[PDB]
Prior knowledge:
Elements: E1 2-3, E2 15-16, E3 23-26, E4 29-32, E5 43-45, E6 50-52, E7 63-67, E8 70-74, E9 84-88, E10 91-95, E11 105-109, E12 112-117, E13 120-121, E14 135-137, E15 149-151
Antiparallel strand pairs: 1-2, 3-4, 5-6, 7-8, 9-10, 11-12, 12-13, 14-15
Amino acid sequence: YFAPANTQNNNIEGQAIVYQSKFLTLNGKKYYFDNDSKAVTGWRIINNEKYYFNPNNAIAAVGLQVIDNNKYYFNPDTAIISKGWQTVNGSRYYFDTDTAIAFNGYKTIDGKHFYFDSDCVVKIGVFSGSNGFEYFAPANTYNNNIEGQAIVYQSKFLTLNGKKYYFDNNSKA
């Protein structure tokens, strides 16, 4: 970190200085520096929370990111990794409670089965699969369900986008 003007230790403008174990923010970009005053360029844990700093410019990742073909969400403000349900760019992604990788396929959360594709939530749903073939409805007609939740929906005629998906009382296609 080459600090402008007289930031610390009466440095010359543009000179690298001692800057250890603290978060730095310039131009809306966050960095973390080790004890040797060098910005770390990998997954790190500081305040019992894990951040991802890029290996090419050492800036803290923000928003949605694809790392090793795994989708993560980092807080746009504090750069902390996100977990659970997070709505970014008009889509409600879900990330692991422990590992933070976004789910894919048909998965069960909160005792409710959800369907995800390309590490992203699908709103239309009505796909297939073991313990699947259900209504992953956006509509909250079933006890104010969350987006992409399975609905029993009983045996009534129904359509989503011109496609007919008449079901039974046991939530089966």
